[PDB]
Design a protein around this ligand. Structure first.
Ligand code: KGM
Length: 158
């Protein structure tokens, strides 16, 4: 079980961390959702599906910078929605394929009442998401740490 990003970076068997760089809608109004779809950025696979079943959760997601300050968040994990920043670990998604496949996570972020102007700055850390991986084979319990960075400013009109 390993993962890779669209940016070309990767995290190998056993876990670790990597940086993810996302383009964001440059203008977002109060009452609108800014979407950060990591499912197009983060992909994982099972290295031995002939024998082993891999289990994957979103263990925890934290908001940083302008996302923590200026937005109200929901995270969608495999069709289900949760508070973001997260209050609990999600149920498991099953990975039974060697073809690299999306980690099904999306952030839905809507401006708070006090947001206005540049609510997210380019190059700033906006989130950390921890993918947790186990299996039905042994005692492996690994963390894949995704550091999410803004590629561009996001403006909330006033
Ligand atoms: C002839 C025995 C081969 C033994 C191969 C074990 C491979 O383990 C890796 O790949 C497994 C399948 O993705 C993961 O469940 C496990 O955590 C680790 O990432």
């Amino acid at each position: 079980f390993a993962c890779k990003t669209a940016n070309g970076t990767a995290i190998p068997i056993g876990g670790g961390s990597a940086n993810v760089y996302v383009n964001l809608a440059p203008v977002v109004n109060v009452g609108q959702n800014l979407v950060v779809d990591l499912s197009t950025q983060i992909f994982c696979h099972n290295d031995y599906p002939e024998t082993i079943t891999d289990y994957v959760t979103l263990q925890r997601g934290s908001a940083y910078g302008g996302v923590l300050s200026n937005f109200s968040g929901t995270v969608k994990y495999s069709g289900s929605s949760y508070p973001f920043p997260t209050t609990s670990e999600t149920p498991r998604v099953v990975y039974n394929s060697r073809t690299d496949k999306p980690w099904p996570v999306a952030l839905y972020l809507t401006p708070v009442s006090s947001a206005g102007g540049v609510a997210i700055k380019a190059g700033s850390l906006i989130a950390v998401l921890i993918l947790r991986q186990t299996n039905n084979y042994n005692s492996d319990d690994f963390q894949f740490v995704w550091n999410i960075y803004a590629n561009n400013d996001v403006v909330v009109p006033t």
